[PDB]
Amino acid sequence: PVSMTKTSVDCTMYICGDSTECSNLLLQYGSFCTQLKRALTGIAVEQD
Amino acid sequence: AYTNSFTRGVYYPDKVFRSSVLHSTQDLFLPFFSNVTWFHVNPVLPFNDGVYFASIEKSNIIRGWIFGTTLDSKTQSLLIVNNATNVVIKVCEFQFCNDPFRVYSSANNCTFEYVSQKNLREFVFKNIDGYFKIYSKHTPIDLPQGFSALEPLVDLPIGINITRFQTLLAYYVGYLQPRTFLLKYNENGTITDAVDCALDPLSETKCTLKSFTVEKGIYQTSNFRVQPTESIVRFPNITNLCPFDEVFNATRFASVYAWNRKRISNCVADYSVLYNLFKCYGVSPTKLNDLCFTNVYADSFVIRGDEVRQIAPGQTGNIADYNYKLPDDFTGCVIAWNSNKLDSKVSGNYNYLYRLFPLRSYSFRPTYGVGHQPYRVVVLSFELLHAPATVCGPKKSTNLVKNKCVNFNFNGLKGTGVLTESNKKFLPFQQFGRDIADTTDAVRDPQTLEILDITPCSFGGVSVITPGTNTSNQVAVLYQGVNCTEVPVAIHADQLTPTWRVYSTGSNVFQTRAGCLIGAEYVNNSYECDIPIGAGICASYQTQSIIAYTMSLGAENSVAYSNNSIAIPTNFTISVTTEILPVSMTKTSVDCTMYICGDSTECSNLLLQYGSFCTQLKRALTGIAVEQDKNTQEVFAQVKQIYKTPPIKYFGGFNFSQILPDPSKPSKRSPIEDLLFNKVTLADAGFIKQYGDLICAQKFKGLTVLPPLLTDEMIAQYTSALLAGTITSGWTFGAGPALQIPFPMQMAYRFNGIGVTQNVLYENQKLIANQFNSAIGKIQDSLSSTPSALGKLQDVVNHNAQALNTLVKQLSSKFGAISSVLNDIFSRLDPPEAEVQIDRLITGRLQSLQTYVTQQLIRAAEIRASANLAATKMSECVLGQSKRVDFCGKGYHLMSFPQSAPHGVVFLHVTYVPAQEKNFTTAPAICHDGKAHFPREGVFVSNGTHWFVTQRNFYEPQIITTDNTFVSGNCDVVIGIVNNTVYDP
Amino acid sequence: NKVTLDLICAQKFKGLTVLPPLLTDEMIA
Numbered sequence A: 001p002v003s004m005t006k007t008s009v010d011c012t013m014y015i016c017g018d019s020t021e022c023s024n025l026l027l028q029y030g031s032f033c034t035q036l037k038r039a040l041t042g043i044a045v046e047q048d
Numbered sequence B: 001a002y003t004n005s006f007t008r009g010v011y012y013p014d015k016v017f018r019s020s021v022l023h024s025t026q027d028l029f030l031p032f033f034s035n036v037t038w039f040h041v042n043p044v045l046p047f048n049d050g051v052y053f054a055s056i057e058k059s060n061i062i063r064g065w066i067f068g069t070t071l072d073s074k075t076q077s078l079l080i081v082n083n084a085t086n087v088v089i090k091v092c093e094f095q096f097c098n099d100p101f102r103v104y105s106s107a108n109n110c111t112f113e114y115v116s117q118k119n120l121r122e123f124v125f126k127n128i129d130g131y132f133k134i135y136s137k138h139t140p141i142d143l144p145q146g147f148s149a150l151e152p153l154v155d156l157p158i159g160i161n162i163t164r165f166q167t168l169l170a171y172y173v174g175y176l177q178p179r180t181f182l183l184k185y186n187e188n189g190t191i192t193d194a195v196d197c198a199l200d201p202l203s204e205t206k207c208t209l210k211s212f213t214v215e216k217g218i219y220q221t222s223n224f225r226v227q228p229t230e231s232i233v234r235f236p237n238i239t240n241l242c243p244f245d246e247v248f249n250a251t252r253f254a255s256v257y258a259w260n261r262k263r264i265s266n267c268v269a270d271y272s273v274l275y276n277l278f279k280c281y282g283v284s285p286t287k288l289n290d291l292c293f294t295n296v297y298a299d300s301f302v303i304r305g306d307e308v309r310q311i312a313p314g315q316t317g318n319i320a321d322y323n324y325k326l327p328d329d330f331t332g333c334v335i336a337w338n339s340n341k342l343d344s345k346v347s348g349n350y351n352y353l354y355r356l357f358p359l360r361s362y363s364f365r366p367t368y369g370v371g372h373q374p375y376r377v378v379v380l381s382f383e384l385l386h387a388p389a390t391v392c393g394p395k396k397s398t399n400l401v402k403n404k405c406v407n408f409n410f411n412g413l414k415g416t417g418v419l420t421e422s423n424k425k426f427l428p429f430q431q432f433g434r435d436i437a438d439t440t441d442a443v444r445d446p447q448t449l450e451i452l453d454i455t456p457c458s459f460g461g462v463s464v465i466t467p468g469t470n471t472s473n474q475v476a477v478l479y480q481g482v483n484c485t486e487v488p489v490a491i492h493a494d495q496l497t498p499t500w501r502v503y504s505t506g507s508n509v510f511q512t513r514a515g516c517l518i519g520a521e522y523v524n525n526s527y528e529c530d531i532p533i534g535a536g537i538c539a540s541y542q543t544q545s546i547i548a549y550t551m552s553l554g555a556e557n558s559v560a561y562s563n564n565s566i567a568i569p570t571n572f573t574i575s576v577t578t579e580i581l582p583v584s585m586t587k588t589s590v591d592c593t594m595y596i597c598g599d600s601t602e603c604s605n606l607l608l609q610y611g612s613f614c615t616q617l618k619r620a621l622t623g624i625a626v627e628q629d630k631n632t633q634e635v636f637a638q639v640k641q642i643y644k645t646p647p648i649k650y651f652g653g654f655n656f657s658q659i660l661p662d663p664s665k666p667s668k669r670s671p672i673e674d675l676l677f678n679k680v681t682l683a684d685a686g687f688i689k690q691y692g693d694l695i696c697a698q699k700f701k702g703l704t705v706l707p708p709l710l711t712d713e714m715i716a717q718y719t720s721a722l723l724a725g726t727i728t729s730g731w732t733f734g735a736g737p738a739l740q741i742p743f744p745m746q747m748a749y750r751f752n753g754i755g756v757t758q759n760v761l762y763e764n765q766k767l768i769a770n771q772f773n774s775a776i777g778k779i780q781d782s783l784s785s786t787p788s789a790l791g792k793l794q795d796v797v798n799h800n801a802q803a804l805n806t807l808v809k810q811l812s813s814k815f816g817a818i819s820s821v822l823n824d825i826f827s828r829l830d831p832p833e834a835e836v837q838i839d840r841l842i843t844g845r846l847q848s849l850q851t852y853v854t855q856q857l858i859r860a861a862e863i864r865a866s867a868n869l870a871a872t873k874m875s876e877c878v879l880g881q882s883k884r885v886d887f888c889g890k891g892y893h894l895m896s897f898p899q900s901a902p903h904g905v906v907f908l909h910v911t912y913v914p915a916q917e918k919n920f921t922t923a924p925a926i927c928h929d930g931k932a933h934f935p936r937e938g939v940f941v942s943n944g945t946h947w948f949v950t951q952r953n954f955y956e957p958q959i960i961t962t963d964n965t966f967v968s969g970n971c972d973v974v975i976g977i978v979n980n981t982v983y984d985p
Numbered sequence C: 001n002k003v004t005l006d007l008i009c010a011q012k013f014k015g016l017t018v019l020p021p022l023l024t025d026e027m028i029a
């Protein structure tokens, strides 16, 4: 094996899904998806 | 008349002082570069969702406003009026004049009054949660293009509905929209710039990274383009109305003693049909519809008005106690109404024989006082047994909207989405459809029975290709997994702002296997990848514009293969190349109690109940910290003896000044080592802090950096010992005692290693030495003027600093509690609820620390792999000569030199690169005297007429004698054997 | 042919996307 599937996540869609009420409650975390998205982006760049 | 708002209308979102920070705020803001209606001097404009109002003047002609819905005397209105020395604010049922400027006729029923106290005056008016918020700013000045934040002026508890407003007399009116803005606070304290996240793709990128400067690259953004949604309810076509018509229009009602009891059940009960004919207990009339019951028990009878009060919970009159005893507590709706014109028989209605003791008769006349008159009563008792409810209200339904993001409720299934018909074929009994996620994706319409396929609205964020904000503000947008005919429908590029719709079409549109790219011109020229888009497509800044292109793999080069031709190098190059390897990372310590429970003792005593979490975290981080010193030791502490180079630094013309220690500096670092030391910027370095920036913030939150065991000076000493050992003894000091050997003789050994005879080095000693010296000088030069050569080490440093800053910022999360401040929770709530809130906060912060530690463990495993590779390189490239291809540089490895870099090692690999090749004819073997000869160590080459034997990596032709070939067999097997003479000496 | 390389749409409707590799199979070939 040389590379794995590159995946990307959008928290707002996965956690909330078009729901504005949930989207506005998810801003009290904020850095947790910045961190998760940054981790997955690092993985994708590493695959390339 | 319309004008450009530019970036006016920003105001301070809250009352908290902030300094040197970027803060995101979702509020009602005037969007940047909006259209402002300009009035010169007073019409009634709408209010919508708040207003921005600017006035450039010098005379004070504009000095007030009215706000309201009708602005007539039938509705409450707000009036703000400045005067010579005061501002008067009133809320009353004003009767405003046709043209107010004396502004109203009547002022009845006031509710609130409050009196207080070229120029540009800006105001922002908002009406939220019953409060009229006013922000303002005044400057001495099209509308200016500076940035100026409005400060809060007053919040008034007016509690009215406002839809339109008018000014009391140039002046400009703009409308606030729900937006997220990224605000920049200065240090001397001020809002000095802002980003409108919904303006355009670059602003979306800036709000996604929470920064005002973006580096070159491609960024996945979060969706800041917020669209409205309407609501649609769809319930089954009602049918089956309850038989209530028979209990409220029956000709003759029963008598209170012989009262009736109907059991209305299994139907829809429209109680609203009343109000056209109503004291409800244990229930409110307005909720009756959306409630359900097992069986509403409808009793009906007739009494005299004086007795209607007795039909109620808690009364104890004669009827309430001798005819119809209604419990003191119950649910229902006593519906009474005078029916004298339906129950007053002339001469006396002796049809309502009421009990009193045994029982007498009411006997109404059509002339009785209001008093004792026929009054019909329907007691609608309700039920709530555990048995299923079967009596319910109408359950009204809305119309159906299609192809619009909507909040829907189909027969009790709620959700947001876009309904777009469907082709799915449900079974007749199936009502919904679910997808792989076990989430609803199709619904059958309860009324029309058609099947609608639910799809998400807002496919999310997009990818933005930027050359960097420093260079340009031009961007391209990639929509992933979409073709360039559906992009405008996908992003809903009709409700978007302008400057966003420019990125949905425009003939600068290119399709890729990754999706649609708009804003870049696809050239057919192929270059190296600059910004990777994917599927072979890259982007770059041409200079002037963003160009997309297919990536180029490299220069094509056909090799002239032939059955008898060989290219042999006639010259060589001594190449010196660098290899940067991380060895260690920052050692970090966390004070678990300080991070989770900062300065709160109750929080600490609660934290004592979550087990060994903090102990496990401390153990993991201590393991990482020890592993870092073990990494450094395994890389640099290979030799046990500290070797020294001789005082005289002559090595056959080889010049190591740039790598050897330099005594003219306290650190004794080498010049290249000094350059590397000044090219990587450390954050903390773990050294004493004297009580009295970001390091201070982290330290106050309990996060510290521990110093490495080996100092930079000791690592430099290890490097210098390695360098001296290799310069003065070759590879011997790695295998046993260091055996001295002159450097040219050692270099001859290393030339032998790569398969070129020793003479080649002894005969080219000066050229080889000068090539090496020039290569080392080029290494220094391309380091003193290289943009990011130490990017790997700097990446280690930045990753550690960024993780620590993320930890510090995650302390502002509430995790669903009332506040992120433990002290406020304890000072506002009693233990019973404070426990819930504090448990939330402690769990959230424990999870944040655990995430940090897990990421540190993973990164430490990566760094340990890198340090193991560095130790292997030190053993096999510095302590020996490697035959492994590309392990110690590109080319035939000669030797390597280590140099300590702040958090890692740099290897200077010296390799031998053949050069200046020449074609020759060649044969497998040479036939002579009927015997086949094969070259001992060489290949047969021909200058065209004569045949020589040469070494393979350097052209040194020799006469083909019997001391450089060997005989095996005859000339009848070897396919290609050539006829020539072997000079038997 | 030997490695088996609506579900993807269903996931993408939940925020999860599979990004294409930068180098195509033809470039790797």
Ligand SMILES: *[C@@H]1O[C@H](CO)[C@@H](O)[C@H](O)[C@H]1NC(C)=O
Pocket (backbone or CB within 6 Å): B002, B033, B034, B035, B497, B498
């Ligand atoms: C302002 O109005 C003009 C036409 O009246 C329109 O072309 C432009 O896009 C508008 N700008 C904004 C930001 O709505």
Ligand SMILES: *[C@@H]1O[C@H](CO)[C@@H](O)[C@H](O)[C@H]1NC(C)=O
Pocket (backbone or CB within 6 Å): B187, B188
């Ligand atoms: C803060 O005030 C000082 C004193 O007048 C001024 O010199 C300085 O410019 C202000 N802040 C900054 C960052 O300039």
Ligand SMILES: *[C@@H]1O[C@H](CO)[C@@H](O)[C@H](O)[C@H]1NC(C)=O
Pocket (backbone or CB within 6 Å): B236, B237, B446, B447, B448
């Ligand atoms: C309710 O009436 C509409 C009008 O024709 C009809 O389409 C629908 O099928 C009816 N509901 C039921 C359950 O039959």
Ligand SMILES: *[C@@H]1O[C@H](CO)[C@@H](O)[C@H](O)[C@H]1NC(C)=O
Pocket (backbone or CB within 6 Å): B482, B483, B484, B485
């Ligand atoms: C997008 O739709 C167009 C219009 O028919 C079609 O030519 C193209 O192949 C489609 N692309 C994708 C990726 O579905």
Ligand SMILES: *[C@@H]1O[C@H](CO)[C@@H](O)[C@H](O)[C@H]1NC(C)=O
Pocket (backbone or CB within 6 Å): B562, B563
């Ligand atoms: C030798 O090379 C020539 C030219 O490439 C070719 O024509 C010939 O077929 C080769 N030898 C054999 C035995 O095929």
Ligand SMILES: *[C@@H]1O[C@H](CO)[C@@H](O)[C@H](O)[C@H]1NC(C)=O
Pocket (backbone or CB within 6 Å): B570, B571, B572
């Ligand atoms: C080999 O290259 C060097 C330059 O690096 C040159 O001075 C020398 O003359 C070359 N040797 C031959 C035999 O051409």
Ligand SMILES: *[C@@H]1O[C@H](CO)[C@@H](O)[C@H](O)[C@H]1NC(C)=O
Pocket (backbone or CB within 6 Å): B655, B656, B657, B658, B777
């Ligand atoms: C070695 O090179 C350095 C830097 O190029 C130079 O300063 C020094 O004089 C050189 N030493 C000798 C002996 O040529």
Ligand SMILES: *[C@@H]1O[C@H](CO)[C@@H](O)[C@H](O)[C@H]1NC(C)=O
Pocket (backbone or CB within 6 Å): B560, B567, B917, B918, B919
């Ligand atoms: C060998 O000959 C081929 C074809 O004549 C030519 O392309 C190639 O450059 C030559 N090689 C050298 C080292 O001159």
Ligand SMILES: *[C@@H]1O[C@H](CO)[C@@H](O)[C@H](O)[C@H]1NC(C)=O
Pocket (backbone or CB within 6 Å): B943, B944, B945, B946, B957
């Ligand atoms: C034979 O090879 C030698 C190389 O040692 C060269 O000097 C000479 O010119 C060659 N002879 C012919 C005829 O090419």
Ligand SMILES: *[C@@H]1O[C@H](CO)[C@@H](O)[C@H](O)[C@H]1NC(C)=O
Pocket (backbone or CB within 6 Å): B927, B977, B978, B979
């Ligand atoms: C070498 O000489 C012999 C002598 O008869 C001859 O038969 C043979 O063909 C020659 N070899 C080649 C490769 O021409």
